[PDB]
Amino acid sequence: AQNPNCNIMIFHPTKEEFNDFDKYIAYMESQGAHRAGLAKIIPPKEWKARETYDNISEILIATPLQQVASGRAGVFTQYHKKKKAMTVGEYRHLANSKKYQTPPHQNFEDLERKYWKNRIYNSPIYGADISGSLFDENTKQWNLGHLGTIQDLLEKECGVVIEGVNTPYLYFGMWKTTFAWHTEDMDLYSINYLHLGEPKTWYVVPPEHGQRLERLARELFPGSSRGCGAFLRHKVALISPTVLKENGIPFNRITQEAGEFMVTFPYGYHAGFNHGFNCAEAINFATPRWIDYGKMASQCSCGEARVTFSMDAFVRILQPERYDLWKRGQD
């Protein structure tokens, strides 16, 4: 069995290996990368996502989200308070202001310590889930706006033709902006490219151990757990590495820098934070190996998780018994 300790693997494809996206994912899996729940891919030195980032300031963040925390430093939830629209140039200036900028620090480890000590005492503003792409249309390799769609994968594997679309999303972050513990919708893969700016630290639980994280979360967030049998789908709960280690939960951590791709694998729980002003692009994707994970994915039916149009068909075809209840939660 490859990668039996479920370590995060880092890949350096050549320019020739970077041509065929599906083939390279399957390669990484042949080496056990999925066992970690997360892999890093460093593009060949010949590759670029686009020519420059000098002209992005006029992108609009229609609904910036202020991430307000409640709880204790290592075990907290966050809610998202909507703020007035602002441009990426305005948001960058905000991120760099004395109120929001990254503090002085020695290295990534010191910064990580400061994040876990101090996160809850501040409310950083995140531009999330903005439909669009920063890949140049002429970038042929690993262009997250040109990937094979999940609907076409389901159709290729299972023969059923379904409605829905699959497009990328932009994320503009600042110091302390936080992504809560979650798996993807329908336990899909994700791919995330850090276009510019400061790093993103990730934490991940191996897929084979995901239920250990879920059981800890039910203990740590007992009211939420009573409210919903899949409350991590709400994407609001944070648990620190120290707490995870205290409770024996297997996990790994890695820091993504600008120019690097991360892939999350089906049912790989992940969480993390941004080091300072940055911009990432991410999208879900599928492979044949995902299908069985999609059929088994938990679902929120309490009404909190509310998701895209395109997830309807996935539930309807893969999970027909659950469909009726889940759809009620959507409506």
Ligand SMILES: O=C(O)CNC(=O)C(=O)O
């Ligand atoms: O970058 C972020 O804020 C969150 N991204 C992801 O969870 C991802 O790519 O799967």
Ligand SMILES: [Mg+2]
């Ligand atoms: Mg612009």
Ligand code: NI
């Ligand atoms: Ni994710």
Ligand SMILES: [Zn+2]
């Ligand atoms: Zn729910």
